[PDB]
Amino acid sequence: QLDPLVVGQEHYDTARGVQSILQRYQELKDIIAILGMDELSEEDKLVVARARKIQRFLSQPFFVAEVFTGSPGKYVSLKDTIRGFKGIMEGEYDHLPEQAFYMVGSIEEAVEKAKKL
């Protein structure tokens, strides 16, 4: 069902951008392992950081996992998730730390978690 004629152009483009930059991060992992992250071009450091922030924002707390951790479960609507990933990809949240995105609901919870570190 991940076709523009089924899910709309905005959803399709967001999903494909996420895939594209996670794949670009996969391609950089092997050189980061050898030489360290300081050899990367200035724009490659940015795709690395945004890829790690996407990887964190993909996490979510569950109502059934509410007994393995203590976090309350979150329900995220499709509109909010594409609204958040489209925001991350184009750099409007570049200033937050990675941990602001770990185990949150919509992006407006990540901006709040950033305040409490």
Added chain:
Amino acid sequence: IIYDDLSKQAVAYRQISLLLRRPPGREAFPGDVFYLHSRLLERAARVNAEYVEAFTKGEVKGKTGSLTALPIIETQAGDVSAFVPTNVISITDGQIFLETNLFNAGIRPAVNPGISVSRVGGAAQTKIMKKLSGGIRTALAQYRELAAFSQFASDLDDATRKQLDHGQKVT
């Protein structure tokens, strides 16, 4: 009950199966090696009092019995992506993974967080212990990976000087 090595019961059963000329599968183990451990470990259970009444013909009215199992598995070179280790991980509830690197570094018992889990979870604990120790294993799951990634220096010292001294003293 403690089975000191299921990874050697599996080898003895493989010997028996190959002497009986049965076709082997992955890693030369028989096809039904999973059914070797499952029908064993599936007997460690907690039973309701109606079952104890129906079994003991009424004599023990209103107590619940249980059998707790702790099988031991030995994995070559620390990998868990292997046939029998993964077969038993797919049967038991929890998973205490003891790591050789931690063990050499003096951290004993070498309980590796992030890989080890308890699928029963906080339901098993006394509520004091449950509340005091809320989510720390997942905290260390990231503390470890970040101390592994951020090797060059303690940069972006927002609270990492507190985080990675708390997570050190906890260990």
Added chain:
Amino acid sequence: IIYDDLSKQAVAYRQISLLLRRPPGREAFPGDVFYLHSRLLERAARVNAEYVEAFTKGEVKGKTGSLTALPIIETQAGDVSAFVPTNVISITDGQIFLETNLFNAGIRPAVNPGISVSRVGGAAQTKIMKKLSGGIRTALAQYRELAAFSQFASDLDDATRKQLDHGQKVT
């Protein structure tokens, strides 16, 4: 004619041949799997005007018949050294290799040039396309030669920087 998953005709034939107790070859495939696909694919042919005129006993003249075959094959993690992929790569006139590392990066259709061959070449092209394609082949070949330096770019000379950023635009 498109054959979708010849690698599933091969599996159905392996099943039939293993239920008949025939001697299993490599990966349990029977010995005659090649002779299964070849006498299929060699039926795709272009046929000259005299064969057509003789077959139809007149009623057609001057015309040449044709039948084009596009068999599809699935590989497990990109390995070409398997049995059925080896046979079919040996039989056909060329290959279009679709790779997942290109598909993920957004290059769609993810055909991998250079690793992909057509032995009919320009003979099956309009002369305008035959004229224009040679510079694309050479551009992508130079790009493949230089691509090792991509993640070290901005260190490079400008004369090779031009080739490197031209190959990216062709891609």
Added chain:
Amino acid sequence: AGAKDIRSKIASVQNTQKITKAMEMVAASKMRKSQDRMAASRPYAETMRKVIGHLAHGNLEYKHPYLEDRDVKRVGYLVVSTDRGLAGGLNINLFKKLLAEMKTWTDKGVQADLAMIGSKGVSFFNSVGGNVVAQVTGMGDNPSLSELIGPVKVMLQAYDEGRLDKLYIVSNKFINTMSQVPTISQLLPLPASDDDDLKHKSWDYLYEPDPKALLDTLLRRYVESQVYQGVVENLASEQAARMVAMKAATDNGGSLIKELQLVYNKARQASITQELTEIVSGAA
């Protein structure tokens, strides 16, 4: 996987480790040669700063623009950077410190200008959009003063012409063979001498031809040495940082060898058994 496919990558990573070891050795020798050339440069600046202190802060203290703190309305920086990568985090720490200070200066609404030594900073600041106005690149292991004459001349002319004020040099201080720190230091207006030449009371030079036109040349030549000194210290710091970085890269390669060999062993065991089981099970 595939046993041959994994052995090929084991060989590739071993070759990489060997290359990085050779680079560590080369850098560890160039570091010594560079840090000796660094010591060969002290006497000029020292024995010239004593003279400048005598003519400037001694008796009959003369008056010169470069000696006094006119009000600041725009600032200038001389930026030294490496011409070669693989130096670790050396250049980016320095450029980030420069951007922090240059942003603090533009909070007050002052304008700022840059002059670049080395190719890396030239590449960086055009991407950030900095106002570079003069540059020299391609110094390599052989930094001449007769090439630094140019941009230092541009900055000095822009200073005495009234445009710039309070110009700086930013560079890496070589402190230990494994410790180099980015520093921003003030060259003009001239920093204040710790020592006092009141003890020079008892003598005065026979200035031929005349003291003011001579102090001008002394001050111009002095900023040049201090810049040149900054360039040579930055070069020795680059060599030390590349040494450390290639050391780390060789150890990372040495661990990837362990992981790849474990994978190769598992692959070859699985291949032996998967072949021999097919053979034995095929024989009815």
Added chain:
Amino acid sequence: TMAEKFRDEGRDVLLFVDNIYRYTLAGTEVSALLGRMPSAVGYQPTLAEEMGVLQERITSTKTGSITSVQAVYVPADDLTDPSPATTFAHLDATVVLSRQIASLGIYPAVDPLDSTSR
């Protein structure tokens, strides 16, 4: 079985096995000759029992004891191969000899960092 007769007399005995890997490999050859199905890496199906039947007789007893020193060979330098993996289950100590220590003119050339005992 000669070491065991020395044990019964009340003595402490040393038994040297010049290469136990060749004991495993000859068991594999005999197993193949008898026509039994090949085990994890082609080794015999009875590998872990043929090894234990030997190594279980080398024990201290309340009349005497047999200690054993066994030269070990690791195929393809693989400490995961079934033969090393089965042998290491029984060893109590492990002494590594290194040529670097001998080039230093130090004898015995025991590597003290990798040498191990439980």
